[PDB]
């Protein structure tokens, strides 16, 4: 939330002191999480290695 650059805003308002937050989940639960994403979220590659002498 940049006041001098209106065009890069991506949130309704700035976060000041005393704002309220919460944690999504439980105290010490463990599980296997599901996932969802777009194609261009992350990228993976395998760098080739050179031969030894």
């Amino acid at each position: 939330y940049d006041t001098t650059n209106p065009q890069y805003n991506s949130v309704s308002r700035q976060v000041e002191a005393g704002d309220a937050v919460s944690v999504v989940g439980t105290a010490s639960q463990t599980m296997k999480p599901n996932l969802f994403y777009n194609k261009f979220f992350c990228g993976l590659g395998s760098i080739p290695l050179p031969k030894l002498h």
Binding site: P50, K51, L52, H53
Partner: protein
Amino acid sequence: TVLTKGEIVLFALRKFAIASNASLTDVEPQSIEDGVNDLEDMMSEWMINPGDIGYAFATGDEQPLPDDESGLPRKYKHAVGYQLLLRMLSDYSLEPTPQVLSNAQRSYDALMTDTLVVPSMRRRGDFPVGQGNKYDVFTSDRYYPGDL
């Protein structure tokens, strides 16, 4: 045998006949302390031109003491003493003689030819290596790396 800063400064004072074991002068300890500080300063700045020599300084906030060990090898005593004498004679306002200048030059040259190292100009990096080296079997790359 240890090589202590106090006796290095004593030798520096002695070589020009300022205060020795056979002199009736009783030179003040403040002069010795100042000489030790000057030696520490000069040997600290010698980490630039002559490189590293083997000196161990007074780590921490503690001040130098004449009895504290220097750690230098015995092979550098005359060179260090001559340089200190040349840098210190101005305190007592004396003009060095050509024999002392020549001896200091000889000792410094011995020090510095002992310390001398020469580098080797490594290959550029895009310079090709010939087919005689039999690359891809004997050597992995077809060009010199030429870097660290």
